[PDB]
Amino acid sequence: AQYEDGKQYTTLEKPVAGAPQVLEFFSFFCPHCYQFEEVLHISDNVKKKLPEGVKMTKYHVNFMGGDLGKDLTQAWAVAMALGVEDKVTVPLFEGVQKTQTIRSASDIRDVFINAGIKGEEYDAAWNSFVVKSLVAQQEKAAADVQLRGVPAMFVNGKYQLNPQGMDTSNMDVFVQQYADTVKYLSEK
C-alpha cells in the first residue's frame, strides 16, 4: 500500500475509546515541538486539510522540565480556558527555548500580561477549578496512550503519526506528507 502501518503511522495496541478526533501533545521544553510550531506550522497545515466536522485538540505534557513543566501545563489550561492559545504559544516557546527568560511561574505569567491578558483575569483563571479539570484532562489524555514522547499526534484514539518515517530533505514536503497522512487516517 502507500500508507502502511509502521511507516507513516503506528497503530495503538490498546485503542482509546471516546478520544478527540485529532489529538496533539507537546511541551514548551520540546525542541522538535518548537520546530513544529514556529517553522513547520504543523497544526495549521493539518487543519487546512482536515474534512468538515473535525475538531483539533492540543495538550501540554508534564514529563519535561520538572516543576516548570507542570506550571506550563497549568498555564496552557489557562490559555485554553481564556481562548488565548494563539497569543501565548510563540512567546512561551521563545521564553523557554530561545531567550531563556522563563524560569518561574511568575515569568510564565509575564508572557500572558505582555500578550494583554489582565492580571486579575489570569490569576483568577490560574486558581479556578475549571482550570483544575482542564489540567486533569491533559493528564488523562496523555495517560490514556501511555505517552513518553512529544511531539505526538493521535487520530481517533487509534492511530499515531510517525514522522520518523517521512522524508525531511524538504520541510514543505514533510509537512504536506504529515498533513496528508492525518487526512488519510481521518477517513479510515
Method: X-ray
- Closest by CA position to 74, among listed 157, 34, 130: 130
d(CA 87, CA 83): 9
Are 50 and 22 within 8 A, CB to CB?
Answer: yes
Residues near 17 by Cβ (< 8 Å), separated by ≥ 6? 157
The C-alpha angle 122, 105, 26, rounded to 5 degrees, equals 90
Q: What's the start-to-end Cα distance of the chain, in Å?
A: 14
Looking at residue 94, the DSSP 8-state letter turns out to be I
- Tell me the β-bridge partners of 58: 24
The architecture in CATH of the region 1-188 reads: 3-Layer(aba) Sandwich (3.40)
Cα–Cα dist 34/38, whole Å: 6
Q: Which residues fall within 8 angstroms of residue 172, CB to CB, at 6 or more apart?
A: none
Alpha-carbon span 127 to 114, nearest angstrom:
20
